Amino acid sequence: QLTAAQELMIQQLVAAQLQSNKRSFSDQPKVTPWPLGADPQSRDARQQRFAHFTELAIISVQEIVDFAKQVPGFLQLGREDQIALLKASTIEIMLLETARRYNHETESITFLKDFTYSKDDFHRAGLQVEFINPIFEFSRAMSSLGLDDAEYALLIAINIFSADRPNVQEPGRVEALQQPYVEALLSYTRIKRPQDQLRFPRMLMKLVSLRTLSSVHSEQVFALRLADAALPPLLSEIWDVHE
Amino acid sequence: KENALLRYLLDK
Ligand SMILES: Cn1cnc(S(=O)(=O)N(Cc2ccc(-c3cccc(S(C)(=O)=O)c3)cc2)Cc2c(F)cccc2Cl)c1
């Protein structure tokens, strides 16, 4: 039912994301270790937990850019549009990738091979309850959709090619690039669950949810600033913290 | 903005 062109398109996205992902696993013993045990009033341990998370965030941004560069169409856009689309999508793709790593049985997200954290751990990494509850809520709703690799890969490509992002100078081209991926996901979902026609809409609706969650994160970011910011340069640059 | 660090990642 998938055309040969669609099978190839999807195979390459799934392979592109596996290649981007194994690059991250190469530099896992290079992230600040999560403090094992440690007195719960140690301010050094508090600092390490924050740094651990912001270093996982940096690896996530590297995976995202590395994947984007492999999505056909992406490198043919102007450089400034490439930047505009990546600046807007980064948080949203980070959250889709967090959702993919959620375990509903144990209610915990596993970053890289085996950095498994609960809500308590997100809070000890310096995150506020206003952001943590939605993240886990979104992850829980994504889990029930039961997305596979092809579906995540396609949804991410679709999310990157959102024409209405701020500062995109050629939205016509960007929207035109979104269409083959939307159509590939429409055909893929129709084959996987041919009885459930509302699965494809339910997935596109998550992109609506990701817009709100993007705002919730910007509030979290302005909240860090008013309490000892200390986000690394790549992260404070992308998310426009200083300029 | 220059976005120097994102550009660096895009370059290689
Ligand atoms: C206070 N604070 C501490 N850290 C922050 S963050 O803004 O840097 N951010 C941390 C973060 C961001 C992304 C990931 C992430 C996502 C996908 C895959 C991977 S992986 C290690 O499998 O490559 C890592 C992990 C931590 C806060 C944050 C989250 F936790 C979770 C999702 C989004 C955000 Cl945005 C604020």
PDB file of C-alpha atoms and ligand atoms in Angstrom:
ATOM      1  CA  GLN A   1       0.000   0.000   0.000  1.00  0.00           C
ATOM      2  CA  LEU A   2       2.954   2.371   0.695  1.00  0.00           C
ATOM      3  CA  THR A   3       4.473   3.424  -2.648  1.00  0.00           C
ATOM      4  CA  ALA A   4       8.132   2.429  -3.269  1.00  0.00           C
ATOM      5  CA  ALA A   5       9.030   6.155  -2.980  1.00  0.00           C
ATOM      6  CA  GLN A   6       7.346   6.307   0.426  1.00  0.00           C
ATOM      7  CA  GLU A   7       9.043   3.152   1.757  1.00  0.00           C
ATOM      8  CA  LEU A   8      12.436   4.603   0.730  1.00  0.00           C
ATOM      9  CA  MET A   9      11.583   8.013   2.257  1.00  0.00           C
ATOM     10  CA  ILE A  10      10.631   6.382   5.586  1.00  0.00           C
ATOM     11  CA  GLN A  11      13.553   3.892   5.644  1.00  0.00           C
ATOM     12  CA  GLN A  12      15.985   6.763   5.257  1.00  0.00           C
ATOM     13  CA  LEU A  13      14.383   8.848   8.054  1.00  0.00           C
ATOM     14  CA  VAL A  14      14.458   5.867  10.447  1.00  0.00           C
ATOM     15  CA  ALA A  15      18.084   5.109   9.468  1.00  0.00           C
ATOM     16  CA  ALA A  16      18.979   8.840   9.680  1.00  0.00           C
ATOM     17  CA  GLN A  17      17.662   8.950  13.268  1.00  0.00           C
ATOM     18  CA  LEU A  18      19.483   5.777  14.320  1.00  0.00           C
ATOM     19  CA  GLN A  19      22.817   7.220  12.982  1.00  0.00           C
ATOM     20  CA  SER A  20      22.176  10.563  14.802  1.00  0.00           C
ATOM     21  CA  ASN A  21      21.367   8.603  17.969  1.00  0.00           C
ATOM     22  CA  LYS A  22      24.450   6.339  18.113  1.00  0.00           C
ATOM     23  CA  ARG A  23      26.682   9.475  17.889  1.00  0.00           C
ATOM     24  CA  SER A  24      25.139  10.558  21.262  1.00  0.00           C
ATOM     25  CA  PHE A  25      25.796   7.112  22.880  1.00  0.00           C
ATOM     26  CA  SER A  26      29.525   7.604  22.001  1.00  0.00           C
ATOM     27  CA  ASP A  27      29.746  10.558  24.509  1.00  0.00           C
ATOM     28  CA  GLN A  28      27.635   9.163  27.436  1.00  0.00           C
ATOM     29  CA  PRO A  29      30.645   8.613  29.763  1.00  0.00           C
ATOM     30  CA  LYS A  30      31.414  12.326  29.109  1.00  0.00           C
ATOM     31  CA  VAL A  31      28.308  13.892  30.791  1.00  0.00           C
ATOM     32  CA  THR A  32      28.651  15.043  34.437  1.00  0.00           C
ATOM     33  CA  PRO A  33      27.668  12.014  36.480  1.00  0.00           C
ATOM     34  CA  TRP A  34      24.347  12.084  38.344  1.00  0.00           C
ATOM     35  CA  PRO A  35      25.272  12.226  42.049  1.00  0.00           C
ATOM     36  CA  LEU A  36      25.028   8.619  43.316  1.00  0.00           C
ATOM     37  CA  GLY A  37      23.576   8.766  46.828  1.00  0.00           C
ATOM     38  CA  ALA A  38      24.873  12.023  48.323  1.00  0.00           C
ATOM     39  CA  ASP A  39      23.598  13.968  51.333  1.00  0.00           C
ATOM     40  CA  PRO A  40      20.301  15.569  50.252  1.00  0.00           C
ATOM     41  CA  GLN A  41      21.499  19.018  51.450  1.00  0.00           C
ATOM     42  CA  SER A  42      24.761  19.011  49.411  1.00  0.00           C
ATOM     43  CA  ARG A  43      24.797  22.133  47.218  1.00  0.00           C
ATOM     44  CA  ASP A  44      27.559  20.547  45.082  1.00  0.00           C
ATOM     45  CA  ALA A  45      25.226  17.624  44.293  1.00  0.00           C
ATOM     46  CA  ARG A  46      22.445  20.135  43.468  1.00  0.00           C
ATOM     47  CA  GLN A  47      24.824  21.804  41.005  1.00  0.00           C
ATOM     48  CA  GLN A  48      25.823  18.464  39.438  1.00  0.00           C
ATOM     49  CA  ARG A  49      22.190  17.450  38.920  1.00  0.00           C
ATOM     50  CA  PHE A  50      21.420  20.718  37.103  1.00  0.00           C
ATOM     51  CA  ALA A  51      24.578  20.381  34.927  1.00  0.00           C
ATOM     52  CA  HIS A  52      23.769  16.719  34.078  1.00  0.00           C
ATOM     53  CA  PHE A  53      20.379  17.785  32.660  1.00  0.00           C
ATOM     54  CA  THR A  54      21.678  20.800  30.705  1.00  0.00           C
ATOM     55  CA  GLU A  55      24.376  18.547  29.196  1.00  0.00           C
ATOM     56  CA  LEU A  56      21.759  15.981  28.120  1.00  0.00           C
ATOM     57  CA  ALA A  57      19.841  18.937  26.604  1.00  0.00           C
ATOM     58  CA  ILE A  58      23.000  19.916  24.610  1.00  0.00           C
ATOM     59  CA  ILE A  59      23.356  16.353  23.245  1.00  0.00           C
ATOM     60  CA  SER A  60      19.639  16.418  22.301  1.00  0.00           C
ATOM     61  CA  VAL A  61      20.162  19.680  20.305  1.00  0.00           C
ATOM     62  CA  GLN A  62      23.145  18.033  18.511  1.00  0.00           C
ATOM     63  CA  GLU A  63      20.988  14.982  17.598  1.00  0.00           C
ATOM     64  CA  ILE A  64      18.240  17.299  16.323  1.00  0.00           C
ATOM     65  CA  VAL A  65      20.487  19.449  14.081  1.00  0.00           C
ATOM     66  CA  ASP A  66      22.267  16.257  12.865  1.00  0.00           C
ATOM     67  CA  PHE A  67      18.892  14.667  11.943  1.00  0.00           C
ATOM     68  CA  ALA A  68      17.486  17.854  10.362  1.00  0.00           C
ATOM     69  CA  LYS A  69      20.504  18.013   8.049  1.00  0.00           C
ATOM     70  CA  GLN A  70      19.591  14.483   6.850  1.00  0.00           C
ATOM     71  CA  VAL A  71      15.869  15.289   6.178  1.00  0.00           C
ATOM     72  CA  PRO A  72      15.581  15.737   2.363  1.00  0.00           C
ATOM     73  CA  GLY A  73      14.606  19.301   1.542  1.00  0.00           C
ATOM     74  CA  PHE A  74      16.127  20.818   4.655  1.00  0.00           C
ATOM     75  CA  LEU A  75      19.614  21.789   3.404  1.00  0.00           C
ATOM     76  CA  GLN A  76      18.089  23.254   0.207  1.00  0.00           C
ATOM     77  CA  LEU A  77      16.307  26.006   2.229  1.00  0.00           C
ATOM     78  CA  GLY A  78      18.224  29.202   2.836  1.00  0.00           C
ATOM     79  CA  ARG A  79      20.544  29.218   5.840  1.00  0.00           C
ATOM     80  CA  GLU A  80      18.486  31.741   7.828  1.00  0.00           C
ATOM     81  CA  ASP A  81      15.311  29.685   7.411  1.00  0.00           C
ATOM     82  CA  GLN A  82      17.252  26.595   8.524  1.00  0.00           C
ATOM     83  CA  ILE A  83      18.121  28.564  11.689  1.00  0.00           C
ATOM     84  CA  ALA A  84      14.576  29.932  12.209  1.00  0.00           C
ATOM     85  CA  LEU A  85      13.030  26.457  11.876  1.00  0.00           C
ATOM     86  CA  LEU A  86      15.590  24.838  14.235  1.00  0.00           C
ATOM     87  CA  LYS A  87      15.287  27.585  16.854  1.00  0.00           C
ATOM     88  CA  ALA A  88      11.462  27.077  17.008  1.00  0.00           C
ATOM     89  CA  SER A  89      11.425  23.239  16.686  1.00  0.00           C
ATOM     90  CA  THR A  90      14.137  22.384  19.183  1.00  0.00           C
ATOM     91  CA  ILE A  91      11.994  22.409  22.295  1.00  0.00           C
ATOM     92  CA  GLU A  92       9.133  20.607  20.494  1.00  0.00           C
ATOM     93  CA  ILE A  93      11.344  17.826  19.113  1.00  0.00           C
ATOM     94  CA  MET A  94      13.080  17.512  22.520  1.00  0.00           C
ATOM     95  CA  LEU A  95       9.602  16.882  24.022  1.00  0.00           C
ATOM     96  CA  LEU A  96       8.615  14.329  21.304  1.00  0.00           C
ATOM     97  CA  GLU A  97      11.910  12.542  22.028  1.00  0.00           C
ATOM     98  CA  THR A  98      11.254  12.675  25.778  1.00  0.00           C
ATOM     99  CA  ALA A  99       7.782  11.207  25.093  1.00  0.00           C
ATOM    100  CA  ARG A 100       9.375   8.402  23.047  1.00  0.00           C
ATOM    101  CA  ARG A 101      11.581   7.535  26.104  1.00  0.00           C
ATOM    102  CA  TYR A 102       8.751   7.506  28.658  1.00  0.00           C
ATOM    103  CA  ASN A 103       7.999   4.168  30.374  1.00  0.00           C
ATOM    104  CA  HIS A 104       4.362   4.102  31.503  1.00  0.00           C
ATOM    105  CA  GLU A 105       4.737   1.012  33.773  1.00  0.00           C
ATOM    106  CA  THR A 106       7.355   2.859  35.935  1.00  0.00           C
ATOM    107  CA  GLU A 107       6.463   6.525  35.058  1.00  0.00           C
ATOM    108  CA  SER A 108      10.059   7.514  34.290  1.00  0.00           C
ATOM    109  CA  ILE A 109      11.997   8.817  31.280  1.00  0.00           C
ATOM    110  CA  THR A 110      15.300   7.159  30.228  1.00  0.00           C
ATOM    111  CA  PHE A 111      17.832   9.486  28.579  1.00  0.00           C
ATOM    112  CA  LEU A 112      20.692   7.892  26.525  1.00  0.00           C
ATOM    113  CA  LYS A 113      21.318   4.194  27.422  1.00  0.00           C
ATOM    114  CA  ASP A 114      20.245   4.168  31.094  1.00  0.00           C
ATOM    115  CA  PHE A 115      19.732   7.573  32.680  1.00  0.00           C
ATOM    116  CA  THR A 116      16.267   6.833  34.079  1.00  0.00           C
ATOM    117  CA  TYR A 117      14.536   9.701  35.967  1.00  0.00           C
ATOM    118  CA  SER A 118      11.208  10.233  37.761  1.00  0.00           C
ATOM    119  CA  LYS A 119       9.302  13.491  38.484  1.00  0.00           C
ATOM    120  CA  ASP A 120      11.180  13.883  41.767  1.00  0.00           C
ATOM    121  CA  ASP A 121      14.462  13.726  39.768  1.00  0.00           C
ATOM    122  CA  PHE A 122      13.284  16.382  37.282  1.00  0.00           C
ATOM    123  CA  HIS A 123      12.529  18.594  40.280  1.00  0.00           C
ATOM    124  CA  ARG A 124      15.986  17.907  41.803  1.00  0.00           C
ATOM    125  CA  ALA A 125      17.550  18.871  38.437  1.00  0.00           C
ATOM    126  CA  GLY A 126      16.121  22.414  38.993  1.00  0.00           C
ATOM    127  CA  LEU A 127      12.817  22.180  37.067  1.00  0.00           C
ATOM    128  CA  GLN A 128       9.532  23.617  38.387  1.00  0.00           C
ATOM    129  CA  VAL A 129       6.256  21.684  38.869  1.00  0.00           C
ATOM    130  CA  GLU A 130       4.586  24.002  36.297  1.00  0.00           C
ATOM    131  CA  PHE A 131       6.788  22.404  33.618  1.00  0.00           C
ATOM    132  CA  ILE A 132       7.269  18.877  34.978  1.00  0.00           C
ATOM    133  CA  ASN A 133       3.570  17.961  35.224  1.00  0.00           C
ATOM    134  CA  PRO A 134       2.808  18.825  31.563  1.00  0.00           C
ATOM    135  CA  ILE A 135       5.958  17.014  30.284  1.00  0.00           C
ATOM    136  CA  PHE A 136       4.864  13.780  31.978  1.00  0.00           C
ATOM    137  CA  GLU A 137       1.246  14.375  30.975  1.00  0.00           C
ATOM    138  CA  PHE A 138       2.213  14.847  27.302  1.00  0.00           C
ATOM    139  CA  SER A 139       4.491  11.788  27.507  1.00  0.00           C
ATOM    140  CA  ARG A 140       1.604   9.748  28.937  1.00  0.00           C
ATOM    141  CA  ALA A 141      -0.764  10.827  26.105  1.00  0.00           C
ATOM    142  CA  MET A 142       1.920  10.061  23.427  1.00  0.00           C
ATOM    143  CA  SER A 143       2.460   6.618  25.001  1.00  0.00           C
ATOM    144  CA  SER A 144      -1.212   5.698  24.440  1.00  0.00           C
ATOM    145  CA  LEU A 145      -0.953   6.540  20.713  1.00  0.00           C
ATOM    146  CA  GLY A 146       1.692   3.775  20.498  1.00  0.00           C
ATOM    147  CA  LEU A 147       3.894   5.486  17.907  1.00  0.00           C
ATOM    148  CA  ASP A 148       6.719   3.508  16.281  1.00  0.00           C
ATOM    149  CA  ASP A 149      10.060   4.685  14.805  1.00  0.00           C
ATOM    150  CA  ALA A 150       8.682   5.589  11.370  1.00  0.00           C
ATOM    151  CA  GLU A 151       5.858   7.607  12.975  1.00  0.00           C
ATOM    152  CA  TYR A 152       8.165   9.521  15.313  1.00  0.00           C
ATOM    153  CA  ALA A 153      10.639  10.153  12.473  1.00  0.00           C
ATOM    154  CA  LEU A 154       7.852  11.471  10.188  1.00  0.00           C
ATOM    155  CA  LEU A 155       6.196  13.598  12.900  1.00  0.00           C
ATOM    156  CA  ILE A 156       9.612  15.218  13.641  1.00  0.00           C
ATOM    157  CA  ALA A 157      10.182  16.014   9.907  1.00  0.00           C
ATOM    158  CA  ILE A 158       6.641  17.440   9.753  1.00  0.00           C
ATOM    159  CA  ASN A 159       7.314  19.558  12.869  1.00  0.00           C
ATOM    160  CA  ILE A 160      10.579  20.956  11.379  1.00  0.00           C
ATOM    161  CA  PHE A 161       8.797  22.090   8.199  1.00  0.00           C
ATOM    162  CA  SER A 162       6.247  24.303   9.978  1.00  0.00           C
ATOM    163  CA  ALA A 163       5.814  27.372   7.668  1.00  0.00           C
ATOM    164  CA  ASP A 164       4.522  29.772  10.353  1.00  0.00           C
ATOM    165  CA  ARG A 165       7.628  29.800  12.589  1.00  0.00           C
ATOM    166  CA  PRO A 166       9.010  33.259  13.539  1.00  0.00           C
ATOM    167  CA  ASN A 167      11.522  34.778  11.057  1.00  0.00           C
ATOM    168  CA  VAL A 168      10.972  32.240   8.265  1.00  0.00           C
ATOM    169  CA  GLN A 169      11.518  34.258   5.073  1.00  0.00           C
ATOM    170  CA  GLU A 170      10.201  31.653   2.572  1.00  0.00           C
ATOM    171  CA  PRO A 171       7.101  30.004   4.170  1.00  0.00           C
ATOM    172  CA  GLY A 172       5.792  28.848   0.769  1.00  0.00           C
ATOM    173  CA  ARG A 173       8.816  26.592   0.264  1.00  0.00           C
ATOM    174  CA  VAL A 174       8.682  25.303   3.848  1.00  0.00           C
ATOM    175  CA  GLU A 175       4.976  24.390   3.600  1.00  0.00           C
ATOM    176  CA  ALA A 176       5.625  22.715   0.234  1.00  0.00           C
ATOM    177  CA  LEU A 177       8.378  20.600   1.888  1.00  0.00           C
ATOM    178  CA  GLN A 178       6.006  19.560   4.689  1.00  0.00           C
ATOM    179  CA  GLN A 179       3.499  17.933   2.290  1.00  0.00           C
ATOM    180  CA  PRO A 180       5.353  14.714   1.272  1.00  0.00           C
ATOM    181  CA  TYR A 181       5.984  13.883   4.958  1.00  0.00           C
ATOM    182  CA  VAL A 182       2.341  14.585   5.918  1.00  0.00           C
ATOM    183  CA  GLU A 183       1.224  12.337   3.074  1.00  0.00           C
ATOM    184  CA  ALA A 184       3.722   9.594   3.990  1.00  0.00           C
ATOM    185  CA  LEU A 185       2.401   9.647   7.587  1.00  0.00           C
ATOM    186  CA  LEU A 186      -1.196   9.639   6.279  1.00  0.00           C
ATOM    187  CA  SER A 187      -0.432   6.451   4.260  1.00  0.00           C
ATOM    188  CA  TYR A 188       1.678   4.819   6.963  1.00  0.00           C
ATOM    189  CA  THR A 189      -0.974   5.253   9.711  1.00  0.00           C
ATOM    190  CA  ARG A 190      -3.707   4.024   7.332  1.00  0.00           C
ATOM    191  CA  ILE A 191      -1.822   0.731   6.770  1.00  0.00           C
ATOM    192  CA  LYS A 192      -0.780   0.198  10.418  1.00  0.00           C
ATOM    193  CA  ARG A 193      -4.293   0.808  11.827  1.00  0.00           C
ATOM    194  CA  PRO A 194      -6.718   0.529   8.900  1.00  0.00           C
ATOM    195  CA  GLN A 195      -9.793   0.461  11.199  1.00  0.00           C
ATOM    196  CA  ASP A 196      -8.840   3.602  13.163  1.00  0.00           C
ATOM    197  CA  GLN A 197      -9.134   6.571  10.779  1.00  0.00           C
ATOM    198  CA  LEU A 198      -8.820   9.021  13.732  1.00  0.00           C
ATOM    199  CA  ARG A 199      -5.268   7.905  14.643  1.00  0.00           C
ATOM    200  CA  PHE A 200      -3.697  10.244  12.068  1.00  0.00           C
ATOM    201  CA  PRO A 201      -5.692  13.321  13.260  1.00  0.00           C
ATOM    202  CA  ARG A 202      -4.917  12.370  16.911  1.00  0.00           C
ATOM    203  CA  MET A 203      -1.180  12.525  15.988  1.00  0.00           C
ATOM    204  CA  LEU A 204      -1.366  15.846  14.155  1.00  0.00           C
ATOM    205  CA  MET A 205      -3.232  17.222  17.202  1.00  0.00           C
ATOM    206  CA  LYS A 206      -0.061  16.632  19.268  1.00  0.00           C
ATOM    207  CA  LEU A 207       1.614  19.353  17.200  1.00  0.00           C
ATOM    208  CA  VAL A 208      -1.063  21.721  18.530  1.00  0.00           C
ATOM    209  CA  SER A 209      -0.199  20.513  22.075  1.00  0.00           C
ATOM    210  CA  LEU A 210       3.503  21.050  21.403  1.00  0.00           C
ATOM    211  CA  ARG A 211       2.828  24.756  20.671  1.00  0.00           C
ATOM    212  CA  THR A 212       1.446  25.306  24.169  1.00  0.00           C
ATOM    213  CA  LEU A 213       4.199  23.250  25.811  1.00  0.00           C
ATOM    214  CA  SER A 214       6.697  25.493  23.946  1.00  0.00           C
ATOM    215  CA  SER A 215       5.242  28.492  25.860  1.00  0.00           C
ATOM    216  CA  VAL A 216       5.313  26.574  29.166  1.00  0.00           C
ATOM    217  CA  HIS A 217       9.080  26.014  28.619  1.00  0.00           C
ATOM    218  CA  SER A 218       9.707  29.730  27.823  1.00  0.00           C
ATOM    219  CA  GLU A 219       8.080  30.527  31.169  1.00  0.00           C
ATOM    220  CA  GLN A 220      10.412  27.934  32.819  1.00  0.00           C
ATOM    221  CA  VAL A 221      13.405  29.656  31.080  1.00  0.00           C
ATOM    222  CA  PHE A 222      12.446  33.202  32.258  1.00  0.00           C
ATOM    223  CA  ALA A 223      11.933  31.568  35.731  1.00  0.00           C
ATOM    224  CA  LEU A 224      15.522  30.197  35.790  1.00  0.00           C
ATOM    225  CA  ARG A 225      16.842  33.728  35.003  1.00  0.00           C
ATOM    226  CA  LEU A 226      15.007  35.061  38.133  1.00  0.00           C
ATOM    227  CA  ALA A 227      16.801  32.440  40.393  1.00  0.00           C
ATOM    228  CA  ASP A 228      20.464  31.757  39.173  1.00  0.00           C
ATOM    229  CA  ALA A 229      20.206  31.126  35.371  1.00  0.00           C
ATOM    230  CA  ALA A 230      23.486  29.401  34.358  1.00  0.00           C
ATOM    231  CA  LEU A 231      22.233  27.703  31.144  1.00  0.00           C
ATOM    232  CA  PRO A 232      25.124  26.787  28.783  1.00  0.00           C
ATOM    233  CA  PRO A 233      25.808  29.064  25.707  1.00  0.00           C
ATOM    234  CA  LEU A 234      24.241  26.902  22.948  1.00  0.00           C
ATOM    235  CA  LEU A 235      21.007  26.614  24.992  1.00  0.00           C
ATOM    236  CA  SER A 236      20.824  30.326  26.018  1.00  0.00           C
ATOM    237  CA  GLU A 237      21.591  31.288  22.370  1.00  0.00           C
ATOM    238  CA  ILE A 238      18.953  29.008  20.762  1.00  0.00           C
ATOM    239  CA  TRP A 239      16.249  30.017  23.261  1.00  0.00           C
ATOM    240  CA  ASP A 240      17.066  33.746  23.017  1.00  0.00           C
ATOM    241  CA  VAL A 241      17.733  34.186  26.752  1.00  0.00           C
ATOM    242  CA  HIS A 242      20.106  37.182  26.377  1.00  0.00           C
ATOM    243  CA  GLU A 243      19.639  38.559  22.829  1.00  0.00           C
TER     244      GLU A 243
ATOM    245  CA  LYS B   1      21.345  37.673  16.217  1.00  0.00           C
ATOM    246  CA  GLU B   2      24.429  35.878  14.882  1.00  0.00           C
ATOM    247  CA  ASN B   3      23.350  32.477  16.342  1.00  0.00           C
ATOM    248  CA  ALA B   4      27.034  31.492  16.089  1.00  0.00           C
ATOM    249  CA  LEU B   5      26.821  28.164  17.971  1.00  0.00           C
ATOM    250  CA  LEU B   6      23.798  26.824  16.064  1.00  0.00           C
ATOM    251  CA  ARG B   7      25.562  27.802  12.795  1.00  0.00           C
ATOM    252  CA  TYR B   8      28.653  25.916  13.930  1.00  0.00           C
ATOM    253  CA  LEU B   9      26.556  22.712  14.338  1.00  0.00           C
ATOM    254  CA  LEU B  10      24.960  23.279  10.902  1.00  0.00           C
ATOM    255  CA  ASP B  11      28.415  23.707   9.261  1.00  0.00           C
ATOM    256  CA  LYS B  12      29.672  20.190  10.127  1.00  0.00           C
TER     257      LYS B  12
HETATM  258  C1  LIG C   1      16.495  23.751  35.252  1.00  0.00           C
HETATM  259  N1  LIG C   1      16.867  23.056  34.037  1.00  0.00           N
HETATM  260  C2  LIG C   1      17.665  21.949  33.964  1.00  0.00           C
HETATM  261  N2  LIG C   1      17.810  21.546  32.724  1.00  0.00           N
HETATM  262  C3  LIG C   1      17.065  22.434  31.984  1.00  0.00           C
HETATM  263  S1  LIG C   1      16.935  22.306  30.248  1.00  0.00           S
HETATM  264  O1  LIG C   1      16.178  23.476  29.827  1.00  0.00           O
HETATM  265  O2  LIG C   1      18.343  22.183  29.919  1.00  0.00           O
HETATM  266  N3  LIG C   1      16.054  20.838  29.858  1.00  0.00           N
HETATM  267  C4  LIG C   1      16.882  19.621  30.085  1.00  0.00           C
HETATM  268  C5  LIG C   1      16.781  18.557  29.046  1.00  0.00           C
HETATM  269  C6  LIG C   1      16.401  18.799  27.744  1.00  0.00           C
HETATM  270  C7  LIG C   1      16.319  17.767  26.839  1.00  0.00           C
HETATM  271  C8  LIG C   1      16.623  16.481  27.218  1.00  0.00           C
HETATM  272  C9  LIG C   1      16.567  15.370  26.294  1.00  0.00           C
HETATM  273  C10 LIG C   1      15.514  15.175  25.426  1.00  0.00           C
HETATM  274  C11 LIG C   1      15.499  14.105  24.556  1.00  0.00           C
HETATM  275  C12 LIG C   1      16.542  13.203  24.535  1.00  0.00           C
HETATM  276  C13 LIG C   1      17.583  13.400  25.420  1.00  0.00           C
HETATM  277  S2  LIG C   1      18.949  12.263  25.425  1.00  0.00           S
HETATM  278  C14 LIG C   1      19.841  12.475  26.924  1.00  0.00           C
HETATM  279  O3  LIG C   1      18.368  10.939  25.285  1.00  0.00           O
HETATM  280  O4  LIG C   1      19.849  12.814  24.425  1.00  0.00           O
HETATM  281  C15 LIG C   1      17.609  14.467  26.289  1.00  0.00           C
HETATM  282  C16 LIG C   1      17.007  16.250  28.520  1.00  0.00           C
HETATM  283  C17 LIG C   1      17.083  17.275  29.430  1.00  0.00           C
HETATM  284  C18 LIG C   1      14.595  20.635  30.293  1.00  0.00           C
HETATM  285  C19 LIG C   1      13.799  19.618  29.468  1.00  0.00           C
HETATM  286  C20 LIG C   1      13.596  18.315  29.883  1.00  0.00           C
HETATM  287  F1  LIG C   1      14.089  17.901  31.058  1.00  0.00           F
HETATM  288  C21 LIG C   1      12.904  17.400  29.116  1.00  0.00           C
HETATM  289  C22 LIG C   1      12.376  17.763  27.898  1.00  0.00           C
HETATM  290  C23 LIG C   1      12.551  19.049  27.459  1.00  0.00           C
HETATM  291  C24 LIG C   1      13.253  19.940  28.240  1.00  0.00           C
HETATM  292 CL1  LIG C   1      13.452  21.536  27.627  1.00  0.00          CL
HETATM  293  C25 LIG C   1      16.468  23.388  32.777  1.00  0.00           C
END
